[PDB]
Amino acid sequence: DFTVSTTEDLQRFRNECVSSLSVPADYVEKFKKWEFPEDDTTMCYIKCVFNKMQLFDDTEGPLVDNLVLQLAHGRDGEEVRTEVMKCVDKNTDNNACHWAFRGFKCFQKNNLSLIKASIKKD
Known part of the structure; x- marks a missing residue:
């Protein structure tokens, strides 16, 4: 199962x-x-980190639900899911490093950071 990475x-x-x-x-x-x-060099690093975070699988590609959990930690989940899905594409150049990085770049362009604070009303 998945846990949000700190x-x-x-x-x-x-x-x-x-x-x-x-x-x-x-x-x-x-x-x-x-x-x-x-x-x-950087693309294969990002792939490796996303592998460890359980955000990307080298054959299946972006792990959408895990991405939503991570990226929505301090955000509206519905909005994040819509954005993640728009960023998700196919392995068009048969290169998992390129594939993982393309996703990362799209998330970044859409202002979806890996780490974000969540304020609780307590």
């Missing part, structure tokens, strides 16, 4: 992906500042 999870995932993908130090500095160049 910043502590994201740190672990970054560290695990940086290690398994042998990401060069200069990219790691960028990733820590949440800055993502559009190149193969």
Whole structure:
């Protein structure tokens, strides 16, 4: 089952992906500042992180419900689902790294951040 990833999870995932993908130090500095160049190194990093977050499966593509849970943590779920569905596309260039990153870029363009606060009325 799925749990919303926090910043502590994201740190672990970054560290695990940086290690398994042998990401060069200069990219790691960028990733820590949440800055993502559009190149193969970065795309495969994003895929790996989305894999760990359970947001993307390399054969099935974007995991829509998990994406809605994550991206709607501090947002209206209905609006988020509509946006996520518009961003979801097919594996048009048979490259899961490109596929995952295209989704990510679309979410970013639609102002759907991975991490957002939720205010509770208590």
